[PDB]
PDB file of N, CA and C in Angstrom:
ATOM      1  N   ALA A 348     -15.572  97.910 116.297  1.00 37.16           N
ATOM      2  CA  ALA A 348     -16.215  97.006 115.347  1.00 37.16           C
ATOM      3  C   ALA A 348     -16.039  95.516 115.719  1.00 37.16           C
ATOM      4  N   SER A 349     -16.884  94.666 115.133  1.00 36.04           N
ATOM      5  CA  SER A 349     -16.680  93.211 115.103  1.00 36.04           C
ATOM      6  C   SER A 349     -15.380  92.845 114.373  1.00 36.04           C
ATOM      7  N   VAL A 350     -14.663  91.818 114.841  1.00 36.83           N
ATOM      8  CA  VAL A 350     -13.288  91.528 114.381  1.00 36.83           C
ATOM      9  C   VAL A 350     -13.185  91.151 112.899  1.00 36.83           C
ATOM     10  N   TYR A 351     -14.244  90.600 112.295  1.00 36.62           N
ATOM     11  CA  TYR A 351     -14.277  90.340 110.847  1.00 36.62           C
ATOM     12  C   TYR A 351     -14.197  91.631 109.996  1.00 36.62           C
ATOM     13  N   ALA A 352     -14.488  92.791 110.597  1.00 39.03           N
ATOM     14  CA  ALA A 352     -14.560  94.111 109.976  1.00 39.03           C
ATOM     15  C   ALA A 352     -13.806  95.166 110.820  1.00 39.03           C
ATOM     16  N   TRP A 353     -12.604  94.816 111.295  1.00 40.15           N
ATOM     17  CA  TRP A 353     -11.750  95.647 112.157  1.00 40.15           C
ATOM     18  C   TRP A 353     -11.621  97.097 111.666  1.00 40.15           C
ATOM     19  N   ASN A 354     -11.589  98.042 112.608  1.00 39.78           N
ATOM     20  CA  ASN A 354     -11.696  99.477 112.332  1.00 39.78           C
ATOM     21  C   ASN A 354     -10.329 100.166 112.478  1.00 39.78           C
ATOM     22  N   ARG A 355      -9.835 100.792 111.403  1.00 38.47           N
ATOM     23  CA  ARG A 355      -8.520 101.452 111.336  1.00 38.47           C
ATOM     24  C   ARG A 355      -8.645 102.973 111.464  1.00 38.47           C
ATOM     25  N   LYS A 356      -7.853 103.558 112.364  1.00 42.39           N
ATOM     26  CA  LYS A 356      -7.631 105.007 112.490  1.00 42.39           C
ATOM     27  C   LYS A 356      -6.342 105.385 111.752  1.00 42.39           C
ATOM     28  N   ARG A 357      -6.406 106.338 110.819  1.00 45.02           N
ATOM     29  CA  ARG A 357      -5.222 107.006 110.247  1.00 45.02           C
ATOM     30  C   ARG A 357      -4.705 108.043 111.243  1.00 45.02           C
ATOM     31  N   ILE A 358      -3.455 107.895 111.660  1.00 46.44           N
ATOM     32  CA  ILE A 358      -2.718 108.874 112.457  1.00 46.44           C
ATOM     33  C   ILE A 358      -1.735 109.576 111.515  1.00 46.44           C
ATOM     34  N   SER A 359      -1.839 110.900 111.421  1.00 49.21           N
ATOM     35  CA  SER A 359      -0.961 111.742 110.603  1.00 49.21           C
ATOM     36  C   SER A 359      -0.915 113.171 111.146  1.00 49.21           C
ATOM     37  N   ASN A 360       0.143 113.913 110.817  1.00 53.52           N
ATOM     38  CA  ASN A 360       0.255 115.355 111.084  1.00 53.52           C
ATOM     39  C   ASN A 360       0.084 115.716 112.574  1.00 53.52           C
ATOM     40  N   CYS A 361       0.825 115.037 113.450  1.00 53.01           N
ATOM     41  CA  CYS A 361       0.749 115.178 114.909  1.00 53.01           C
ATOM     42  C   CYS A 361       1.999 114.589 115.589  1.00 53.01           C
ATOM     43  N   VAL A 362       2.230 114.918 116.866  1.00 50.38           N
ATOM     44  CA  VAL A 362       3.310 114.301 117.657  1.00 50.38           C
ATOM     45  C   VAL A 362       2.795 113.078 118.419  1.00 50.38           C
ATOM     46  N   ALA A 363       3.393 111.920 118.160  1.00 51.29           N
ATOM     47  CA  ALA A 363       3.048 110.646 118.774  1.00 51.29           C
ATOM     48  C   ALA A 363       3.849 110.448 120.067  1.00 51.29           C
ATOM     49  N   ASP A 364       3.372 111.008 121.179  1.00 51.54           N
ATOM     50  CA  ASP A 364       3.927 110.688 122.494  1.00 51.54           C
ATOM     51  C   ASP A 364       3.328 109.382 123.032  1.00 51.54           C
ATOM     52  N   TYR A 365       4.012 108.276 122.765  1.00 49.98           N
ATOM     53  CA  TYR A 365       3.672 106.951 123.264  1.00 49.98           C
ATOM     54  C   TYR A 365       3.857 106.807 124.792  1.00 49.98           C
ATOM     55  N   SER A 366       4.421 107.780 125.521  1.00 49.07           N
ATOM     56  CA  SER A 366       4.734 107.599 126.950  1.00 49.07           C
ATOM     57  C   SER A 366       3.507 107.387 127.838  1.00 49.07           C
ATOM     58  N   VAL A 367       2.346 107.931 127.461  1.00 50.61           N
ATOM     59  CA  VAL A 367       1.076 107.617 128.134  1.00 50.61           C
ATOM     60  C   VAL A 367       0.741 106.125 128.011  1.00 50.61           C
ATOM     61  N   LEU A 368       1.043 105.506 126.866  1.00 47.68           N
ATOM     62  CA  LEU A 368       0.872 104.071 126.645  1.00 47.68           C
ATOM     63  C   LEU A 368       1.898 103.268 127.457  1.00 47.68           C
ATOM     64  N   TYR A 369       3.163 103.717 127.522  1.00 48.83           N
ATOM     65  CA  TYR A 369       4.207 103.059 128.332  1.00 48.83           C
ATOM     66  C   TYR A 369       3.802 102.937 129.810  1.00 48.83           C
ATOM     67  N   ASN A 370       3.026 103.898 130.317  1.00 50.04           N
ATOM     68  CA  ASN A 370       2.559 103.958 131.704  1.00 50.04           C
ATOM     69  C   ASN A 370       1.090 103.514 131.878  1.00 50.04           C
ATOM     70  N   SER A 371       0.419 103.073 130.809  1.00 52.47           N
ATOM     71  CA  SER A 371      -0.990 102.657 130.826  1.00 52.47           C
ATOM     72  C   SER A 371      -1.155 101.231 131.371  1.00 52.47           C
ATOM     73  N   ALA A 372      -0.846 101.037 132.656  1.00 51.02           N
ATOM     74  CA  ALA A 372      -0.833  99.733 133.330  1.00 51.02           C
ATOM     75  C   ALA A 372      -2.179  98.976 133.291  1.00 51.02           C
ATOM     76  N   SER A 373      -3.283  99.661 132.979  1.00 53.41           N
ATOM     77  CA  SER A 373      -4.594  99.055 132.703  1.00 53.41           C
ATOM     78  C   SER A 373      -4.611  98.153 131.457  1.00 53.41           C
ATOM     79  N   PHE A 374      -3.639  98.280 130.546  1.00 51.97           N
ATOM     80  CA  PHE A 374      -3.475  97.352 129.429  1.00 51.97           C
ATOM     81  C   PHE A 374      -3.105  95.950 129.934  1.00 51.97           C
ATOM     82  N   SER A 375      -4.011  94.993 129.728  1.00 52.36           N
ATOM     83  CA  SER A 375      -3.812  93.563 129.994  1.00 52.36           C
ATOM     84  C   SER A 375      -2.681  92.968 129.144  1.00 52.36           C
ATOM     85  N   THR A 376      -2.382  93.561 127.982  1.00 55.50           N
ATOM     86  CA  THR A 376      -1.069  93.423 127.332  1.00 55.50           C
ATOM     87  C   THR A 376      -0.722  94.632 126.458  1.00 55.50           C
ATOM     88  N   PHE A 377       0.574  94.864 126.259  1.00 54.06           N
ATOM     89  CA  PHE A 377       1.151  95.827 125.319  1.00 54.06           C
ATOM     90  C   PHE A 377       2.423  95.206 124.706  1.00 54.06           C
ATOM     91  N   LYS A 378       2.228  94.228 123.814  1.00 51.78           N
ATOM     92  CA  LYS A 378       3.302  93.570 123.051  1.00 51.78           C
ATOM     93  C   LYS A 378       3.784  94.470 121.916  1.00 51.78           C
ATOM     94  N   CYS A 379       5.028  94.296 121.480  1.00 56.68           N
ATOM     95  CA  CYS A 379       5.512  94.849 120.215  1.00 56.68           C
ATOM     96  C   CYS A 379       6.429  93.865 119.491  1.00 56.68           C
ATOM     97  N   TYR A 380       6.451  93.967 118.164  1.00 57.13           N
ATOM     98  CA  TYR A 380       7.207  93.105 117.259  1.00 57.13           C
ATOM     99  C   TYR A 380       7.989  93.974 116.268  1.00 57.13           C
ATOM    100  N   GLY A 381       9.210  93.559 115.931  1.00 54.07           N
ATOM    101  CA  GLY A 381      10.168  94.334 115.131  1.00 54.07           C
ATOM    102  C   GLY A 381      10.836  95.508 115.869  1.00 54.07           C
ATOM    103  N   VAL A 382      10.128  96.183 116.782  1.00 51.56           N
ATOM    104  CA  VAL A 382      10.591  97.385 117.511  1.00 51.56           C
ATOM    105  C   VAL A 382      10.205  97.326 118.996  1.00 51.56           C
ATOM    106  N   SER A 383      11.087  97.791 119.887  1.00 48.59           N
ATOM    107  CA  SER A 383      10.809  97.923 121.329  1.00 48.59           C
ATOM    108  C   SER A 383       9.873  99.105 121.628  1.00 48.59           C
ATOM    109  N   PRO A 384       8.871  98.975 122.522  1.00 50.03           N
ATOM    110  CA  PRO A 384       7.952 100.071 122.829  1.00 50.03           C
ATOM    111  C   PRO A 384       8.681 101.323 123.338  1.00 50.03           C
ATOM    112  N   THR A 385       9.662 101.185 124.236  1.00 53.01           N
ATOM    113  CA  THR A 385      10.395 102.329 124.819  1.00 53.01           C
ATOM    114  C   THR A 385      11.137 103.176 123.778  1.00 53.01           C
ATOM    115  N   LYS A 386      11.495 102.588 122.629  1.00 54.03           N
ATOM    116  CA  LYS A 386      12.174 103.280 121.529  1.00 54.03           C
ATOM    117  C   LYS A 386      11.242 104.206 120.734  1.00 54.03           C
ATOM    118  N   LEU A 387       9.929 103.962 120.744  1.00 55.00           N
ATOM    119  CA  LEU A 387       8.978 104.634 119.848  1.00 55.00           C
ATOM    120  C   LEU A 387       8.977 106.173 119.971  1.00 55.00           C
ATOM    121  N   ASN A 388       9.155 106.732 121.173  1.00 52.47           N
ATOM    122  CA  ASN A 388       9.270 108.183 121.383  1.00 52.47           C
ATOM    123  C   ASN A 388      10.511 108.841 120.731  1.00 52.47           C
ATOM    124  N   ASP A 389      11.478 108.085 120.204  1.00 52.34           N
ATOM    125  CA  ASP A 389      12.607 108.632 119.430  1.00 52.34           C
ATOM    126  C   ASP A 389      12.336 108.700 117.910  1.00 52.34           C
ATOM    127  N   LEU A 390      11.250 108.089 117.419  1.00 51.55           N
ATOM    128  CA  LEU A 390      11.052 107.772 115.994  1.00 51.55           C
ATOM    129  C   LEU A 390      10.236 108.811 115.199  1.00 51.55           C
ATOM    130  N   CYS A 391      10.215 108.637 113.872  1.00 47.50           N
ATOM    131  CA  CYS A 391       9.349 109.335 112.914  1.00 47.50           C
ATOM    132  C   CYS A 391       8.857 108.381 111.804  1.00 47.50           C
ATOM    133  N   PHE A 392       7.662 108.635 111.262  1.00 48.80           N
ATOM    134  CA  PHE A 392       6.980 107.822 110.246  1.00 48.80           C
ATOM    135  C   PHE A 392       6.131 108.692 109.303  1.00 48.80           C
ATOM    136  N   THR A 393       5.883 108.215 108.083  1.00 47.29           N
ATOM    137  CA  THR A 393       4.985 108.866 107.116  1.00 47.29           C
ATOM    138  C   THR A 393       3.531 108.716 107.535  1.00 47.29           C
ATOM    139  N   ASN A 394       3.087 107.472 107.732  1.00 46.14           N
ATOM    140  CA  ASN A 394       1.745 107.135 108.201  1.00 46.14           C
ATOM    141  C   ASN A 394       1.841 106.231 109.431  1.00 46.14           C
ATOM    142  N   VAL A 395       0.892 106.382 110.350  1.00 46.59           N
ATOM    143  CA  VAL A 395       0.701 105.476 111.484  1.00 46.59           C
ATOM    144  C   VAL A 395      -0.761 105.040 111.525  1.00 46.59           C
ATOM    145  N   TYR A 396      -1.009 103.792 111.908  1.00 51.17           N
ATOM    146  CA  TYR A 396      -2.337 103.187 111.930  1.00 51.17           C
ATOM    147  C   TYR A 396      -2.642 102.564 113.289  1.00 51.17           C
ATOM    148  N   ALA A 397      -3.913 102.586 113.688  1.00 52.47           N
ATOM    149  CA  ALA A 397      -4.410 101.843 114.843  1.00 52.47           C
ATOM    150  C   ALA A 397      -5.659 101.024 114.462  1.00 52.47           C
TER     151      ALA A 397
ATOM    152  N   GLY U 447       9.325  73.685 118.963  1.00 49.79           N
ATOM    153  CA  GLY U 447      10.232  74.820 119.154  1.00 49.79           C
ATOM    154  C   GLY U 447      11.339  74.584 120.183  1.00 49.79           C
ATOM    155  N   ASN U 448      12.599  74.831 119.801  1.00 46.82           N
ATOM    156  CA  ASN U 448      13.755  74.695 120.692  1.00 46.82           C
ATOM    157  C   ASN U 448      14.045  75.999 121.458  1.00 46.82           C
ATOM    158  N   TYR U 449      13.777  76.011 122.764  1.00 47.21           N
ATOM    159  CA  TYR U 449      13.929  77.191 123.628  1.00 47.21           C
ATOM    160  C   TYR U 449      15.286  77.286 124.350  1.00 47.21           C
ATOM    161  N   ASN U 450      16.234  76.388 124.058  1.00 48.07           N
ATOM    162  CA  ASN U 450      17.578  76.427 124.650  1.00 48.07           C
ATOM    163  C   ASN U 450      18.470  77.563 124.114  1.00 48.07           C
ATOM    164  N   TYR U 451      18.145  78.145 122.955  1.00 44.72           N
ATOM    165  CA  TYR U 451      18.943  79.203 122.336  1.00 44.72           C
ATOM    166  C   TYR U 451      18.366  80.584 122.637  1.00 44.72           C
ATOM    167  N   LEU U 452      19.209  81.463 123.175  1.00 46.33           N
ATOM    168  CA  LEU U 452      18.814  82.712 123.824  1.00 46.33           C
ATOM    169  C   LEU U 452      19.543  83.938 123.263  1.00 46.33           C
ATOM    170  N   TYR U 453      18.847  85.069 123.239  1.00 46.45           N
ATOM    171  CA  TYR U 453      19.402  86.394 122.984  1.00 46.45           C
ATOM    172  C   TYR U 453      18.901  87.384 124.038  1.00 46.45           C
ATOM    173  N   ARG U 454      19.751  88.307 124.486  1.00 47.49           N
ATOM    174  CA  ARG U 454      19.339  89.442 125.315  1.00 47.49           C
ATOM    175  C   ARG U 454      18.472  90.372 124.470  1.00 47.49           C
ATOM    176  N   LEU U 455      17.252  90.659 124.925  1.00 47.41           N
ATOM    177  CA  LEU U 455      16.291  91.480 124.185  1.00 47.41           C
ATOM    178  C   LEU U 455      16.633  92.976 124.256  1.00 47.41           C
ATOM    179  N   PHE U 456      16.988  93.451 125.450  1.00 47.53           N
ATOM    180  CA  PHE U 456      17.297  94.849 125.766  1.00 47.53           C
ATOM    181  C   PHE U 456      18.367  94.960 126.862  1.00 47.53           C
ATOM    182  N   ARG U 457      19.043  96.113 126.921  1.00 48.16           N
ATOM    183  CA  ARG U 457      20.138  96.414 127.859  1.00 48.16           C
ATOM    184  C   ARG U 457      20.166  97.908 128.185  1.00 48.16           C
ATOM    185  N   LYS U 458      20.725  98.282 129.338  1.00 48.80           N
ATOM    186  CA  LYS U 458      20.886  99.692 129.756  1.00 48.80           C
ATOM    187  C   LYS U 458      21.847 100.510 128.879  1.00 48.80           C
ATOM    188  N   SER U 459      22.792  99.858 128.200  1.00 49.03           N
ATOM    189  CA  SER U 459      23.759 100.477 127.278  1.00 49.03           C
ATOM    190  C   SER U 459      24.306  99.459 126.270  1.00 49.03           C
ATOM    191  N   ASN U 460      24.880  99.934 125.165  1.00 48.02           N
ATOM    192  CA  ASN U 460      25.542  99.098 124.161  1.00 48.02           C
ATOM    193  C   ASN U 460      26.736  98.332 124.771  1.00 48.02           C
ATOM    194  N   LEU U 461      26.932  97.077 124.373  1.00 46.76           N
ATOM    195  CA  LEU U 461      28.175  96.338 124.593  1.00 46.76           C
ATOM    196  C   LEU U 461      29.353  97.025 123.881  1.00 46.76           C
ATOM    197  N   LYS U 462      30.517  97.095 124.529  1.00 43.84           N
ATOM    198  CA  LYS U 462      31.787  97.376 123.840  1.00 43.84           C
ATOM    199  C   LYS U 462      32.201  96.177 122.970  1.00 43.84           C
ATOM    200  N   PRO U 463      33.102  96.343 121.989  1.00 43.23           N
ATOM    201  CA  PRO U 463      33.580  95.230 121.178  1.00 43.23           C
ATOM    202  C   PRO U 463      34.160  94.084 122.010  1.00 43.23           C
ATOM    203  N   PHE U 464      33.762  92.852 121.691  1.00 42.00           N
ATOM    204  CA  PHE U 464      34.053  91.639 122.464  1.00 42.00           C
ATOM    205  C   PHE U 464      33.712  91.717 123.971  1.00 42.00           C
ATOM    206  N   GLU U 465      32.844  92.636 124.414  1.00 42.44           N
ATOM    207  CA  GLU U 465      32.294  92.608 125.774  1.00 42.44           C
ATOM    208  C   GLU U 465      31.354  91.405 125.923  1.00 42.44           C
ATOM    209  N   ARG U 466      31.490  90.653 127.019  1.00 44.03           N
ATOM    210  CA  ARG U 466      30.646  89.495 127.341  1.00 44.03           C
ATOM    211  C   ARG U 466      29.812  89.796 128.583  1.00 44.03           C
ATOM    212  N   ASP U 467      28.491  89.654 128.497  1.00 42.51           N
ATOM    213  CA  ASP U 467      27.571  90.003 129.586  1.00 42.51           C
ATOM    214  C   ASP U 467      26.502  88.926 129.795  1.00 42.51           C
ATOM    215  N   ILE U 468      26.663  88.146 130.865  1.00 42.52           N
ATOM    216  CA  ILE U 468      25.849  86.964 131.177  1.00 42.52           C
ATOM    217  C   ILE U 468      24.777  87.255 132.251  1.00 42.52           C
ATOM    218  N   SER U 469      24.759  88.455 132.845  1.00 42.67           N
ATOM    219  CA  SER U 469      23.852  88.794 133.955  1.00 42.67           C
ATOM    220  C   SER U 469      22.370  88.761 133.550  1.00 42.67           C
ATOM    221  N   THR U 470      21.498  88.249 134.424  1.00 42.58           N
ATOM    222  CA  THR U 470      20.065  88.013 134.144  1.00 42.58           C
ATOM    223  C   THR U 470      19.114  88.795 135.061  1.00 42.58           C
ATOM    224  N   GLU U 471      19.590  89.865 135.702  1.00 44.77           N
ATOM    225  CA  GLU U 471      18.774  90.723 136.576  1.00 44.77           C
ATOM    226  C   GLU U 471      17.594  91.373 135.823  1.00 44.77           C
ATOM    227  N   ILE U 472      16.454  91.538 136.500  1.00 38.84           N
ATOM    228  CA  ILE U 472      15.201  92.023 135.903  1.00 38.84           C
ATOM    229  C   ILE U 472      15.357  93.456 135.376  1.00 38.84           C
ATOM    230  N   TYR U 473      15.040  93.641 134.097  1.00 37.34           N
ATOM    231  CA  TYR U 473      15.113  94.907 133.380  1.00 37.34           C
ATOM    232  C   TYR U 473      13.906  95.799 133.695  1.00 37.34           C
ATOM    233  N   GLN U 474      14.173  96.971 134.276  1.00 36.48           N
ATOM    234  CA  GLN U 474      13.193  98.040 134.454  1.00 36.48           C
ATOM    235  C   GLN U 474      13.024  98.828 133.144  1.00 36.48           C
ATOM    236  N   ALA U 475      11.937  98.556 132.420  1.00 33.47           N
ATOM    237  CA  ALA U 475      11.593  99.187 131.144  1.00 33.47           C
ATOM    238  C   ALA U 475      10.814 100.519 131.275  1.00 33.47           C
ATOM    239  N   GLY U 476      10.557 101.008 132.494  1.00 36.24           N
ATOM    240  CA  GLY U 476       9.781 102.232 132.725  1.00 36.24           C
ATOM    241  C   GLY U 476       9.707 102.651 134.196  1.00 36.24           C
ATOM    242  N   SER U 477       8.713 103.469 134.541  1.00 36.99           N
ATOM    243  CA  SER U 477       8.546 104.050 135.887  1.00 36.99           C
ATOM    244  C   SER U 477       8.312 103.028 137.015  1.00 36.99           C
ATOM    245  N   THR U 478       7.924 101.785 136.701  1.00 39.20           N
ATOM    246  CA  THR U 478       7.600 100.755 137.700  1.00 39.20           C
ATOM    247  C   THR U 478       8.818 100.398 138.571  1.00 39.20           C
ATOM    248  N   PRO U 479       8.734 100.454 139.914  1.00 39.17           N
ATOM    249  CA  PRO U 479       9.748  99.869 140.793  1.00 39.17           C
ATOM    250  C   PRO U 479       9.673  98.333 140.727  1.00 39.17           C
ATOM    251  N   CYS U 480      10.547  97.718 139.929  1.00 38.97           N
ATOM    252  CA  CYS U 480      10.432  96.298 139.581  1.00 38.97           C
ATOM    253  C   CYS U 480      10.879  95.331 140.687  1.00 38.97           C
ATOM    254  N   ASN U 481      11.827  95.738 141.539  1.00 39.03           N
ATOM    255  CA  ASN U 481      12.226  95.045 142.774  1.00 39.03           C
ATOM    256  C   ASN U 481      12.591  93.547 142.602  1.00 39.03           C
ATOM    257  N   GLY U 482      13.039  93.132 141.412  1.00 41.59           N
ATOM    258  CA  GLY U 482      13.340  91.729 141.089  1.00 41.59           C
ATOM    259  C   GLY U 482      12.121  90.834 140.802  1.00 41.59           C
ATOM    260  N   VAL U 483      10.960  91.410 140.469  1.00 41.50           N
ATOM    261  CA  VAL U 483       9.697  90.692 140.213  1.00 41.50           C
ATOM    262  C   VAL U 483       9.195  90.956 138.786  1.00 41.50           C
ATOM    263  N   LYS U 484       8.758  89.916 138.062  1.00 42.65           N
ATOM    264  CA  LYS U 484       8.181  90.062 136.713  1.00 42.65           C
ATOM    265  C   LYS U 484       6.831  90.792 136.737  1.00 42.65           C
ATOM    266  N   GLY U 485       6.578  91.658 135.755  1.00 37.57           N
ATOM    267  CA  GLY U 485       5.312  92.390 135.623  1.00 37.57           C
ATOM    268  C   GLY U 485       5.356  93.531 134.605  1.00 37.57           C
ATOM    269  N   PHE U 486       4.429  94.482 134.714  1.00 38.00           N
ATOM    270  CA  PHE U 486       4.315  95.601 133.777  1.00 38.00           C
ATOM    271  C   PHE U 486       5.558  96.511 133.810  1.00 38.00           C
ATOM    272  N   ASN U 487       6.235  96.640 132.662  1.00 36.13           N
ATOM    273  CA  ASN U 487       7.557  97.264 132.509  1.00 36.13           C
ATOM    274  C   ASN U 487       8.694  96.593 133.313  1.00 36.13           C
ATOM    275  N   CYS U 488       8.545  95.329 133.712  1.00 35.27           N
ATOM    276  CA  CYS U 488       9.504  94.620 134.560  1.00 35.27           C
ATOM    277  C   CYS U 488       9.773  93.220 134.004  1.00 35.27           C
ATOM    278  N   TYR U 489      10.885  93.064 133.284  1.00 34.99           N
ATOM    279  CA  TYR U 489      11.075  91.933 132.374  1.00 34.99           C
ATOM    280  C   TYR U 489      12.358  91.144 132.641  1.00 34.99           C
ATOM    281  N   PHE U 490      12.285  89.820 132.516  1.00 31.86           N
ATOM    282  CA  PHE U 490      13.477  88.981 132.409  1.00 31.86           C
ATOM    283  C   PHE U 490      14.228  89.343 131.109  1.00 31.86           C
ATOM    284  N   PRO U 491      15.549  89.604 131.144  1.00 29.45           N
ATOM    285  CA  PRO U 491      16.230  90.324 130.062  1.00 29.45           C
ATOM    286  C   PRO U 491      16.497  89.493 128.798  1.00 29.45           C
ATOM    287  N   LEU U 492      16.438  88.160 128.881  1.00 30.48           N
ATOM    288  CA  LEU U 492      16.646  87.278 127.733  1.00 30.48           C
ATOM    289  C   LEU U 492      15.329  86.884 127.047  1.00 30.48           C
ATOM    290  N   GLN U 493      15.455  86.469 125.793  1.00 26.39           N
ATOM    291  CA  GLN U 493      14.416  85.974 124.898  1.00 26.39           C
ATOM    292  C   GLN U 493      14.946  84.773 124.112  1.00 26.39           C
ATOM    293  N   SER U 494      14.057  83.987 123.505  1.00 27.07           N
ATOM    294  CA  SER U 494      14.437  82.839 122.675  1.00 27.07           C
ATOM    295  C   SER U 494      13.765  82.849 121.304  1.00 27.07           C
ATOM    296  N   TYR U 495      14.482  82.364 120.288  1.00 24.40           N
ATOM    297  CA  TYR U 495      13.951  82.150 118.938  1.00 24.40           C
ATOM    298  C   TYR U 495      12.982  80.955 118.839  1.00 24.40           C
ATOM    299  N   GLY U 496      13.054  79.999 119.776  1.00 23.31           N
ATOM    300  CA  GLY U 496      12.142  78.852 119.832  1.00 23.31           C
ATOM    301  C   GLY U 496      12.168  77.962 118.584  1.00 23.31           C
TER     302      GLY U 496
END
C-alpha cells in the first residue's frame, strides 16, 4: 500500500523462525529497537504484526 | 546529541560481577565471516545514547 494507508499482516498460531530474516542479506536494512534481532528465535508472543 | 557516552550493545557471554571489558573487536552477529570489517551481521560492539 501507499504509506498514508500502511498495510498490516496479523501473525498468529504459527512458529516464527526469524533465522531466514537474520540471513536475508538483500535487506538494505534490518534495524531493531527494544530487542536484539538474534534473540527473537528464543521468544514467544500473543500477537505479532508486520 | 552528546555521543561521548557509550554502552556495549551485545557480547558473546554475560559479564561476571565487577568484570571490566574494554575490548572493541567487531561482533559477528550471524553466519557472515566479518574479518574485522563493518557490514551485514558485522558490528562495532559499542553504542551511544547521544
